[PDB]
Amino acid sequence: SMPFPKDCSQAMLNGDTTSGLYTIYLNGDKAQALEVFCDMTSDGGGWIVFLRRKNGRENFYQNWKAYAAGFGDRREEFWLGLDNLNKITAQGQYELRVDLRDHGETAFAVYDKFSVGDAKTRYKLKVEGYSGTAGDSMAYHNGRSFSTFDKNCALSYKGAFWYRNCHRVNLMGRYGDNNHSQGVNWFHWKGHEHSIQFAEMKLRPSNFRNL
């Protein structure tokens, strides 16, 4: 086992094959502990979950400081935090996976290369190298800064995202809201008038597939 695993891939190889809450350590530093939810079952496991939508109990219409820090219940609906995502993705080359489920249908998207810049970049998104069944809806968002209502798509849609003008992905939108572009959307899967029931965004080292 690794004493200070830097992500869910290093926490898993530590033997723990059960999805749930684990401690990771940013840069392997025992003073930078972070409790994360690890999805240890999806496509070989080792995923840090950083967004979960599943029941509309949590408010995602939150401010910059809330999106920077993270909020919610890591066992239910939550957002891990942009500062956390920047620090994790700075540790090496990470891959993004998005799992979607709605009325029994499932889809996914994986991106070879996923990073989140620091606060000076307004947490700039990098997403490249798409594969999957959901359709490449993140390409639209590639290179965009993060936006919240207080830093206007976030206001007009009542969510938060790496908005452009405005979105093909809105996983932090209003739960159960089928009004055009207001809901939990993945446009190239279910369009803008269909709020998705279940959505997770998660990350692990891109080299995990052959480590």
Ligand SMILES: Cc1ccsc1CNC(C)(C)CO
């Ligand atoms: C195209 C694609 C989509 C998901 S994983 C993936 C492959 N990535 C590698 C292994 C070639 C480089 O890390």
